[PDB]
Amino acid sequence: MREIVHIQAGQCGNQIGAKFWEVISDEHGIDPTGSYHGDSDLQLERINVYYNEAAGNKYVPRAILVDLEPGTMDSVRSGPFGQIFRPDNFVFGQSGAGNNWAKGHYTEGAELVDSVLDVVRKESESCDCLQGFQLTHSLGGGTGSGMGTLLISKIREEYPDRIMNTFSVVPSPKVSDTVVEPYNATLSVHQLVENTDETYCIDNEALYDICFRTLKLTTPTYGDLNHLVSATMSGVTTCLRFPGQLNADLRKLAVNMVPFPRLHFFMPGFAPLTSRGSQQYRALTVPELTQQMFDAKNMMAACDPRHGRYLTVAAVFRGRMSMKEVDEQMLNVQNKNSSYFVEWIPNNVKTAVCDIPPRGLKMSATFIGNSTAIQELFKRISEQFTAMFRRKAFLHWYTGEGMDEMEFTEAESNMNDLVSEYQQYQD
């Protein structure tokens, strides 16, 4: 009624908040329903009663907001798209923001990580049955990286039933930090094993390929990258939520992409990438839309999935097209991709359709999946970790925050086997 919990953390999460959510007074945001049926309104609200429950649907913005260094305060709160809301906003009172997992996660966050409990409580209550826990977050965030794992852990701890949906940001061959090797590795052991159900990837090093291949943009931008993601979330969050002929509730999301317990991670795409001008090619196609949903080039992640096999593929299309058309087309993908399909597993591809195409695309395509490929996204941060942080060690910084050989060694070995165990499928 499948209502919704909004948790936004760090930089990537708060800012990312800025761009997910504004794609919403597009109106469906997270579980009211209604509104969005005959236009109207806008902003950071409407006409009723506040708090909270007008959530992401009519009179209110429901979110749980978590900033740990008053960057998200000012960046959006004020002049920008929102109000937000008041009372729903965290500002860490200067904590001084931390780079380092151990740091808002063990340190300033605990203190706030407790203040984030009150937000979660009030939202949880809302009079609706909440099925999502939505969290933005940043490999190399400390606030996000190790505050997001704190937030995630209690939420799995107290809300076992409610699979967490977490948006991710990652490491690609380009960098932030230097401590992000290991920072996101510790953000890991907790992202597998920390009640985070499914896990999104949003590599910023892969986001560019998209905003620049598919798209033309001449000079991207960090705000424009926020157009990208909205895509990847609306399909999941709005789509299926919003009306629909085969509809997949978030929980279909956790059985469809996880085929087992360790935190199944996914990659996701939006096709309708389009080119402003090129605007003119394939009238929002399905094959079009299927086509773009597998390519090595249209995935909005830092794995190039082609190396290996996917294990689970969840795709979603909400254009008003044939329920026969989407399902008939997705097969063709599956047969020129064998090796990309997991021999176990039949039905290697799930398809969902919802009933309203994104405001102004006319016809949409969202994609989800796990392949064997990710043995990649990590056999990269781990090579990184062993030779980095854990190496000749880089954690004095973190060594004060409170983590001592632990949270490093455990995060490599647990996150490691991830590599072996993951591979295990299809070697």
Partner: protein, 440 residues
């Protein structure tokens, strides 16, 4: 007088009804057409006093009726902006338990909690009137509300109402599909009907429908909103026909025995031979008795059940509208004249034929013809014997082989629900095969 009781089960089901309940739109109803002047939404028929659900009126004026939604989703439709059809209030269930895909979920979990209240609805519902001779279940082979919920809702209904054989519909996986869950999963949903109860069942093979739409009608582009009519219509033949005044009439208790050749729930196929295009020109009209053949054509065939394999078994054909007696006796003979039909070793003039009136109903362009001669093949052939194999290759590898249950356990029982459902639905494969593999 011999009412049906109509139960939905899942997404597949709440809609499918929309196909069933719209197709009804001719003044009929589950088992009471005993007649009505209303039309349309029924609005225009009057209000005689009343309130939710209608005392003023019979099922006729308003339906046989019971929708189960474990998500508002489809149910909000049928409730949707008084979706053009207000077919009653309070024959819907809408459980905001949050939907669950799992045979385990909804069936063991959220469903347990609201299978009851439903049972209550059914019971009351099962009481207002006389002769209910039927229970309809729309079922999938994937949808949490459709497996365990149905293995729940069929199971309780079988247990509670042993005398009233249930009829359930199906929408089974094939080569393509949804989920990964559904290779096993529906397996699980297949165990339960079975010996829990159930009677004859029917399916629309979603991979058969969109096929027949591409080999027999036209519109490769097509939406499920249209595939429902192919399957929607199957019912109209089964209930509206046999449930309406005519020559040689098979009731819901005719369905059970004519399909059922031995007792491990049996399965059936639906063929609708009238399927002519909006873009056709059937040889001004399509020959009535060719209609029979239409049936056998592997092509009308709803499912990917290669009849190629084996010998049919029970063949129940329901002809409606302007059919001729000499068409049946004399066209039905013909089939049993080809090599191929290969009826079984103990089939004894297998073919059961009913005639119903009026005509082939229809609505709109998506509806094809105005064909005035129908064949519905409901059969039990060895084939089925192989689609379950299909699901069993999937299962030996998808669920059990290396296991996809960690979602599912989460909701309830392990090591049978799975192991028991493979071994019991398995032998189905062996037992089925042995039903038709030698003279003995």
């Amino acid at each position: 007088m011999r009412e049906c009781i109509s139960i939905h089960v899942g997404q597949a089901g709440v809609q499918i009804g929309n196909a069933c309940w719209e197709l009804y739109c001719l003044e009929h109803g589950i088992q009471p057409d005993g007649q009505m002047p209303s039309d349309k939404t029924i609005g225009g028929g009057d209000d005689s006093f009343n309130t939710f659900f209608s005392e003023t009126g019979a099922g006729k004026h308003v339906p046989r009726a019971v929708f189960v939604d474990l998500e508002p989703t489809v149910i909000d439709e049928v409730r949707t902006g008084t979706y053009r059809q207000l077919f009653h209030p309070e024959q819907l269930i809408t459980g905001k338990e949050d939907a669950a895909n799992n045979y385990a979920r909804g069936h063991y979990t959220i469903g347990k909690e609201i299978i009851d209240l439903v049972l209550d609805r059914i019971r009351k519902l099962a009481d207002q009137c006389t002769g209910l001779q039927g229970f309809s279940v729309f079922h999938s082979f994937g949808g949490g509300t459709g497996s365990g919920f149905t293995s729940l809702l069929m199971e309780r209904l079988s247990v509670d109402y042993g005398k009233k054989s249930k009829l359930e519909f199906s929408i089974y996986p094939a080569p393509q599909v949804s989920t990964a869950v559904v290779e096993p999963y529906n397996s699980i949903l297949t165990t339960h009907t079975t010996l829990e109860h159930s009677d004859c069942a029917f399916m629309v093979d979603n991979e058969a429908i969109y096929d027949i739409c591409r080999r027999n009608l036209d519109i490769e582009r097509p939406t499920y909103t249209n595939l429902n009519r192919l399957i929607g219509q199957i019912v109209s033949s089964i209930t509206a026909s046999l449930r309406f005044d005519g020559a040689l009439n098979v009731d819901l208790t005719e369905f059970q025995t004519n399909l059922v050749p031995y007792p491990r729930g049996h399965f059936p196929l639906a063929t609708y031979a009238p399927v002519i295009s909006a873009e056709k020109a059937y040889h001004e009209q399509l020959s009535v008795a060719e209609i029979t053949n239409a049936c056998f054509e592997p092509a009308n065939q709803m499912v990917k059940c290669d009849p190629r394999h084996g010998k049919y078994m029970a063949c129940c054909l329901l002809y409606r509208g302007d059919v001729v007696p000499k068409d049946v006796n004399a066209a039905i003979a013909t089939i049993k004249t080809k090599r191929t039909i290969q009826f079984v070793d103990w089939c004894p003039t297998g073919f059961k034929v009913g005639i119903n009136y009026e005509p082939p109903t229809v609505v709109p362009g998506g509806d094809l013809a105005k064909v005035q001669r129908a064949v519905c093949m409901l059969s039990n052939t060895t084939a089925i014997a192989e689609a379950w194999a299909r699901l069993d290759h999937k299962f030996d590898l998808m669920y059990a082989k290396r296991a996809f249950v960690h979602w599912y356990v989460g909701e309830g029982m392990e090591e049978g629900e799975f192991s028991e459902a493979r071994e019991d639905m398995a032998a189905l494969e062996k037992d089925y095969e042995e039903v038709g593999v030698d003279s003995v």
